[PDB]
């Protein structure tokens, strides 16, 4: 019952409750003949929300904010983008228009600028070296090293053991690497091992695209990226 491209109506964004104070958000775009979905996270803190990733573009991000107000009814006050691609920063300007304080690592801001993408307003310090971790409200933000992209971050919600892997982690049904234009295929297995070692109690692992699973998605990703 996790939302998919087969059931989300065109142009809509859906939320899915994962645990106490934690939702995923799911949005779609059609590229060529194929409809794709992308996941992010929403985490409650006191009477506000922290958003992890845009909903992949400005139009979807406007829909996301409306869906959040309808279903949750608390303000999004901060966001984190987990890497520089459109599915993560596309819609940052919508978030800024809506009064959200937008964050990512310094490297992501640089890569987003270089790519001509939207750029979060604020940098997360102390994330520059592989293995760096910072607390940010109700989550930990971890830079595990280069994988899908040079800058990719993961986000853990310690109270409920939810790991948002972003595009560093593949869904179970995905058996080929697909697009690796910004990837570091050599470092990806080591990066996965760092995630495994850091979050051994995670109960839910959310990939950047596709269905949630558990810690088995980590080794699955290594297997696919070698393949
Ligand atoms: Zn990407």
Swiss-Prot record:
One of its GO terms (molecular function) is zinc ion binding. GO terms for biological process: antibiotic catabolic process; response to antibiotic. Zn(2+) 2 binds at residues 87, 167, 209. One of its GO terms (cellular component) is periplasmic space. Its main location: periplasm. It holds the Pfam family Lactamase_B. Zn(2+) 1 binds at residues 83, 85, 148. Its EC number is 3.5.2.6. It comes from the Bacteria. Changing residue 164 to Y: Increases catalytic efficiency about 30-fold, with respect to benzylpenicillin and ampicillin. Increases catalytic efficiency about 10-fold, with respect to various cephalosporin antibiotics, including ceftazidime. It catalyses: a beta-lactam + H2O = a substituted beta-amino acid. SUPFAM superfamilies: Metallo-hydrolase/oxidoreductase. It is found in: Periplasm. Its cofactor is Zn(2+). Keywords: Antibiotic resistance, Hydrolase, Metal-binding, Periplasm, Plasmid, Signal, Zinc. Class B beta-lactamase which confers resistance to the beta-lactam antibiotics, including penicillins, cephalosporins and carbapenems. Acts via hydrolysis of the beta-lactam ring. Has penicillin-, cephalosporin- and carbapenem-hydrolyzing activities. This is Metallo-beta-lactamase VIM-7. It comes from Pseudomonas aeruginosa.
């Amino acid at each position: 019952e996790y939302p998919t491209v087969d059931d989300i109506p065109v142009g809509e964004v859906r939320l899915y409750k994962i645990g106490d104070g934690v939702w995923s958000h799911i949005a779609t775009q059609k590229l060529g003949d194929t409809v794709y979905s992308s996941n992010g996270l929403i985490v409650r803190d006191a009477d506000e929300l922290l958003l992890i990733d845009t909903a992949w573009g400005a139009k979807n991000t406007v829909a996301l904010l409306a869906e959040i107000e309808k279903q949750i009814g608390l303000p999004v006050t901060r966001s984190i983008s987990t890497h520089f691609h459109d599915d993560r920063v596309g819609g940052v300007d919508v978030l800024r228009a809506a009064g959200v304080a937008t964050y990512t690592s310094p490297l992501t801001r640089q890569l987003a600028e270089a790519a001509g993408n939207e750029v979060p307003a604020h940098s997360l310090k102390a994330l520059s070296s592989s293995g760096d971790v910072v607390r940010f409200g109700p989550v930990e933000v971890f830079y595990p090293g280069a994988a899908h992209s040079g800058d990719n971050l993961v986000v853990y919600v310690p109270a409920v053991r939810v790991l948002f892997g972003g595009c560093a982690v593949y869904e179970a049904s995905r058996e080929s690497a697909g697009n690796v234009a910004d990837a570091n295929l050599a470092e990806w297995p080591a990066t996965i091992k760092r995630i495994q070692q850091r979050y051994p109690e995670a109960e839910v692992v959310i990939p950047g695209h596709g269905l949630p699973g558990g810690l088995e998605l980590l080794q699955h990703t290594t297997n696919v990226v070698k393949t």
